[PDB]
Amino acid sequence: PRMPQIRRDITGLANLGEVYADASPDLFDGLDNAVTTARTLNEQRGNLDQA
Amino acid sequence: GTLLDEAATAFGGLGPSLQRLVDSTQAIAGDFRANIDPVNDIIENSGPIIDS
């Protein structure tokens, strides 16, 4: 009885995979540079709190 | 003779393998029935979030 919902789930999964695969390289480059700036923020936590 | 040869070819030494097949089938079916509410919940509620 829940087979239309299964079909909806599978089609949505395919579409979401396509969208994520299209949006992933930018996300991961941003995550690399965000790792750099997050390391910078962690190294100066006391300065940030005093600020 | 032909049927016996075919049955011997199909069931030569599959004793342990068929035993494992049947035991795995029954265990998986029983466990799947035991957890049918989570399966139904996943099937129902996966669509909204994914389509969102």
mmCIF file with all atom_site columns, C-alpha atoms in Angstrom:
data_model
loop_
_atom_site.group_PDB
_atom_site.id
_atom_site.type_symbol
_atom_site.label_atom_id
_atom_site.label_alt_id
_atom_site.label_comp_id
_atom_site.label_asym_id
_atom_site.label_entity_id
_atom_site.label_seq_id
_atom_site.pdbx_PDB_ins_code
_atom_site.Cartn_x
_atom_site.Cartn_y
_atom_site.Cartn_z
_atom_site.occupancy
_atom_site.B_iso_or_equiv
_atom_site.pdbx_formal_charge
_atom_site.auth_seq_id
_atom_site.auth_comp_id
_atom_site.auth_asym_id
_atom_site.auth_atom_id
_atom_site.pdbx_PDB_model_num
ATOM 1   C CA . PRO A 1 1  ? 0.000  0.000   0.000   1.00 0.00 ? 1  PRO A CA 1
ATOM 2   C CA . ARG A 1 2  ? 2.930  2.398   0.570   1.00 0.00 ? 2  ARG A CA 1
ATOM 3   C CA . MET A 1 3  ? 4.461  1.877   -2.882  1.00 0.00 ? 3  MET A CA 1
ATOM 4   C CA . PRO A 1 4  ? 3.665  5.370   -4.281  1.00 0.00 ? 4  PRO A CA 1
ATOM 5   C CA . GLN A 1 5  ? 5.573  6.728   -1.291  1.00 0.00 ? 5  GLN A CA 1
ATOM 6   C CA . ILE A 1 6  ? 8.474  4.387   -2.113  1.00 0.00 ? 6  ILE A CA 1
ATOM 7   C CA . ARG A 1 7  ? 8.497  5.670   -5.702  1.00 0.00 ? 7  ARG A CA 1
ATOM 8   C CA . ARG A 1 8  ? 8.444  9.256   -4.427  1.00 0.00 ? 8  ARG A CA 1
ATOM 9   C CA . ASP A 1 9  ? 11.337 8.495   -2.065  1.00 0.00 ? 9  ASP A CA 1
ATOM 10  C CA . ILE A 1 10 ? 13.453 6.906   -4.810  1.00 0.00 ? 10 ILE A CA 1
ATOM 11  C CA . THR A 1 11 ? 12.844 9.730   -7.297  1.00 0.00 ? 11 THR A CA 1
ATOM 12  C CA . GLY A 1 12 ? 13.551 12.355  -4.647  1.00 0.00 ? 12 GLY A CA 1
ATOM 13  C CA . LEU A 1 13 ? 16.717 10.514  -3.641  1.00 0.00 ? 13 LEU A CA 1
ATOM 14  C CA . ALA A 1 14 ? 17.949 10.580  -7.241  1.00 0.00 ? 14 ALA A CA 1
ATOM 15  C CA . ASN A 1 15 ? 17.156 14.288  -7.604  1.00 0.00 ? 15 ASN A CA 1
ATOM 16  C CA . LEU A 1 16 ? 18.772 15.163  -4.261  1.00 0.00 ? 16 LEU A CA 1
ATOM 17  C CA . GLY A 1 17 ? 21.878 13.204  -5.202  1.00 0.00 ? 17 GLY A CA 1
ATOM 18  C CA . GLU A 1 18 ? 22.103 15.161  -8.452  1.00 0.00 ? 18 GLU A CA 1
ATOM 19  C CA . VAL A 1 19 ? 21.697 18.484  -6.629  1.00 0.00 ? 19 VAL A CA 1
ATOM 20  C CA . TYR A 1 20 ? 24.292 17.587  -3.983  1.00 0.00 ? 20 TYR A CA 1
ATOM 21  C CA . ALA A 1 21 ? 26.751 16.371  -6.624  1.00 0.00 ? 21 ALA A CA 1
ATOM 22  C CA . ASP A 1 22 ? 26.302 19.666  -8.474  1.00 0.00 ? 22 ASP A CA 1
ATOM 23  C CA . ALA A 1 23 ? 26.760 21.759  -5.311  1.00 0.00 ? 23 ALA A CA 1
ATOM 24  C CA . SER A 1 24 ? 29.522 19.717  -3.636  1.00 0.00 ? 24 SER A CA 1
ATOM 25  C CA . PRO A 1 25 ? 32.822 21.047  -5.133  1.00 0.00 ? 25 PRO A CA 1
ATOM 26  C CA . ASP A 1 26 ? 32.028 24.603  -4.039  1.00 0.00 ? 26 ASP A CA 1
ATOM 27  C CA . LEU A 1 27 ? 30.987 23.344  -0.602  1.00 0.00 ? 27 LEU A CA 1
ATOM 28  C CA . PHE A 1 28 ? 34.231 21.425  -0.116  1.00 0.00 ? 28 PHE A CA 1
ATOM 29  C CA . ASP A 1 29 ? 36.478 24.255  -1.337  1.00 0.00 ? 29 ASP A CA 1
ATOM 30  C CA . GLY A 1 30 ? 34.627 26.539  1.062   1.00 0.00 ? 30 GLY A CA 1
ATOM 31  C CA . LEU A 1 31 ? 35.110 23.942  3.789   1.00 0.00 ? 31 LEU A CA 1
ATOM 32  C CA . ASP A 1 32 ? 38.869 23.862  3.119   1.00 0.00 ? 32 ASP A CA 1
ATOM 33  C CA . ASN A 1 33 ? 39.219 27.627  3.389   1.00 0.00 ? 33 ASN A CA 1
ATOM 34  C CA . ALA A 1 34 ? 36.828 27.617  6.358   1.00 0.00 ? 34 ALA A CA 1
ATOM 35  C CA . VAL A 1 35 ? 39.121 25.044  7.982   1.00 0.00 ? 35 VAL A CA 1
ATOM 36  C CA . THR A 1 36 ? 41.980 27.501  7.489   1.00 0.00 ? 36 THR A CA 1
ATOM 37  C CA . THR A 1 37 ? 40.090 30.414  9.054   1.00 0.00 ? 37 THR A CA 1
ATOM 38  C CA . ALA A 1 38 ? 38.690 28.164  11.808  1.00 0.00 ? 38 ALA A CA 1
ATOM 39  C CA . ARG A 1 39 ? 42.227 27.122  12.714  1.00 0.00 ? 39 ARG A CA 1
ATOM 40  C CA . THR A 1 40 ? 43.060 30.832  12.843  1.00 0.00 ? 40 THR A CA 1
ATOM 41  C CA . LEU A 1 41 ? 40.064 31.512  15.106  1.00 0.00 ? 41 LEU A CA 1
ATOM 42  C CA . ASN A 1 42 ? 40.957 28.590  17.393  1.00 0.00 ? 42 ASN A CA 1
ATOM 43  C CA . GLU A 1 43 ? 44.560 29.770  17.753  1.00 0.00 ? 43 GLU A CA 1
ATOM 44  C CA . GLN A 1 44 ? 43.300 33.160  19.034  1.00 0.00 ? 44 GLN A CA 1
ATOM 45  C CA . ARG A 1 45 ? 40.274 32.274  21.166  1.00 0.00 ? 45 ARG A CA 1
ATOM 46  C CA . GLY A 1 46 ? 41.479 34.472  24.025  1.00 0.00 ? 46 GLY A CA 1
ATOM 47  C CA . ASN A 1 47 ? 41.921 37.452  21.709  1.00 0.00 ? 47 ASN A CA 1
ATOM 48  C CA . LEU A 1 48 ? 38.390 36.991  20.353  1.00 0.00 ? 48 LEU A CA 1
ATOM 49  C CA . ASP A 1 49 ? 36.867 36.751  23.841  1.00 0.00 ? 49 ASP A CA 1
ATOM 50  C CA . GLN A 1 50 ? 38.771 39.826  25.041  1.00 0.00 ? 50 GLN A CA 1
ATOM 51  C CA . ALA A 1 51 ? 37.640 41.674  21.912  1.00 0.00 ? 51 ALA A CA 1
ATOM 52  C CA . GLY B 2 1  ? 18.096 -40.313 -15.884 1.00 0.00 ? 1  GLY B CA 1
ATOM 53  C CA . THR B 2 2  ? 18.157 -36.788 -17.314 1.00 0.00 ? 2  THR B CA 1
ATOM 54  C CA . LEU B 2 3  ? 16.187 -35.378 -14.370 1.00 0.00 ? 3  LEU B CA 1
ATOM 55  C CA . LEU B 2 4  ? 18.472 -37.112 -11.872 1.00 0.00 ? 4  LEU B CA 1
ATOM 56  C CA . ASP B 2 5  ? 21.568 -35.751 -13.632 1.00 0.00 ? 5  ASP B CA 1
ATOM 57  C CA . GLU B 2 6  ? 20.117 -32.227 -13.604 1.00 0.00 ? 6  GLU B CA 1
ATOM 58  C CA . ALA B 2 7  ? 19.159 -32.503 -9.926  1.00 0.00 ? 7  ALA B CA 1
ATOM 59  C CA . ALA B 2 8  ? 22.652 -33.753 -9.062  1.00 0.00 ? 8  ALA B CA 1
ATOM 60  C CA . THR B 2 9  ? 24.187 -30.836 -10.973 1.00 0.00 ? 9  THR B CA 1
ATOM 61  C CA . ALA B 2 10 ? 21.903 -28.338 -9.223  1.00 0.00 ? 10 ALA B CA 1
ATOM 62  C CA . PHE B 2 11 ? 22.246 -29.905 -5.760  1.00 0.00 ? 11 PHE B CA 1
ATOM 63  C CA . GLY B 2 12 ? 25.745 -31.402 -5.806  1.00 0.00 ? 12 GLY B CA 1
ATOM 64  C CA . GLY B 2 13 ? 27.194 -30.156 -2.536  1.00 0.00 ? 13 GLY B CA 1
ATOM 65  C CA . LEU B 2 14 ? 24.892 -27.250 -1.707  1.00 0.00 ? 14 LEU B CA 1
ATOM 66  C CA . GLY B 2 15 ? 23.846 -28.779 1.625   1.00 0.00 ? 15 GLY B CA 1
ATOM 67  C CA . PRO B 2 16 ? 25.513 -26.272 3.957   1.00 0.00 ? 16 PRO B CA 1
ATOM 68  C CA . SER B 2 17 ? 24.970 -23.417 1.491   1.00 0.00 ? 17 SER B CA 1
ATOM 69  C CA . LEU B 2 18 ? 21.229 -24.083 1.162   1.00 0.00 ? 18 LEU B CA 1
ATOM 70  C CA . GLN B 2 19 ? 21.003 -24.524 4.941   1.00 0.00 ? 19 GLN B CA 1
ATOM 71  C CA . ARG B 2 20 ? 22.599 -21.096 5.392   1.00 0.00 ? 20 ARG B CA 1
ATOM 72  C CA . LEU B 2 21 ? 20.287 -19.673 2.715   1.00 0.00 ? 21 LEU B CA 1
ATOM 73  C CA . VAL B 2 22 ? 17.137 -20.922 4.460   1.00 0.00 ? 22 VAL B CA 1
ATOM 74  C CA . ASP B 2 23 ? 18.319 -19.887 7.935   1.00 0.00 ? 23 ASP B CA 1
ATOM 75  C CA . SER B 2 24 ? 19.283 -16.413 6.703   1.00 0.00 ? 24 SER B CA 1
ATOM 76  C CA . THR B 2 25 ? 15.967 -16.031 4.873   1.00 0.00 ? 25 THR B CA 1
ATOM 77  C CA . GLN B 2 26 ? 13.911 -16.945 7.937   1.00 0.00 ? 26 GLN B CA 1
ATOM 78  C CA . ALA B 2 27 ? 15.985 -14.766 10.286  1.00 0.00 ? 27 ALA B CA 1
ATOM 79  C CA . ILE B 2 28 ? 15.816 -11.730 7.987   1.00 0.00 ? 28 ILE B CA 1
ATOM 80  C CA . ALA B 2 29 ? 12.070 -12.151 7.403   1.00 0.00 ? 29 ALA B CA 1
ATOM 81  C CA . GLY B 2 30 ? 11.338 -12.461 11.121  1.00 0.00 ? 30 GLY B CA 1
ATOM 82  C CA . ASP B 2 31 ? 13.497 -9.469  12.021  1.00 0.00 ? 31 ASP B CA 1
ATOM 83  C CA . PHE B 2 32 ? 11.959 -7.408  9.205   1.00 0.00 ? 32 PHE B CA 1
ATOM 84  C CA . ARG B 2 33 ? 8.460  -8.154  10.494  1.00 0.00 ? 33 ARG B CA 1
ATOM 85  C CA . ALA B 2 34 ? 9.600  -7.315  14.035  1.00 0.00 ? 34 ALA B CA 1
ATOM 86  C CA . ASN B 2 35 ? 10.699 -3.850  12.830  1.00 0.00 ? 35 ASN B CA 1
ATOM 87  C CA . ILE B 2 36 ? 7.882  -3.060  10.406  1.00 0.00 ? 36 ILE B CA 1
ATOM 88  C CA . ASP B 2 37 ? 6.901  0.152   12.230  1.00 0.00 ? 37 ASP B CA 1
ATOM 89  C CA . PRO B 2 38 ? 10.339 1.795   11.685  1.00 0.00 ? 38 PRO B CA 1
ATOM 90  C CA . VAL B 2 39 ? 10.251 0.682   8.036   1.00 0.00 ? 39 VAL B CA 1
ATOM 91  C CA . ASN B 2 40 ? 6.799  2.210   7.553   1.00 0.00 ? 40 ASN B CA 1
ATOM 92  C CA . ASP B 2 41 ? 7.921  5.401   9.305   1.00 0.00 ? 41 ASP B CA 1
ATOM 93  C CA . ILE B 2 42 ? 10.979 5.675   7.043   1.00 0.00 ? 42 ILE B CA 1
ATOM 94  C CA . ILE B 2 43 ? 8.921  5.066   3.893   1.00 0.00 ? 43 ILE B CA 1
ATOM 95  C CA . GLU B 2 44 ? 6.267  7.608   4.899   1.00 0.00 ? 44 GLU B CA 1
ATOM 96  C CA . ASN B 2 45 ? 8.486  10.373  6.281   1.00 0.00 ? 45 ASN B CA 1
ATOM 97  C CA . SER B 2 46 ? 11.507 10.162  3.961   1.00 0.00 ? 46 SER B CA 1
ATOM 98  C CA . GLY B 2 47 ? 9.693  11.853  1.073   1.00 0.00 ? 47 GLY B CA 1
ATOM 99  C CA . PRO B 2 48 ? 8.866  15.205  2.718   1.00 0.00 ? 48 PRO B CA 1
ATOM 100 C CA . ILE B 2 49 ? 12.422 16.001  3.868   1.00 0.00 ? 49 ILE B CA 1
ATOM 101 C CA . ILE B 2 50 ? 14.057 14.804  0.648   1.00 0.00 ? 50 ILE B CA 1
ATOM 102 C CA . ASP B 2 51 ? 11.640 16.753  -1.552  1.00 0.00 ? 51 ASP B CA 1
ATOM 103 C CA . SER B 2 52 ? 12.116 19.786  0.700   1.00 0.00 ? 52 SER B CA 1
#
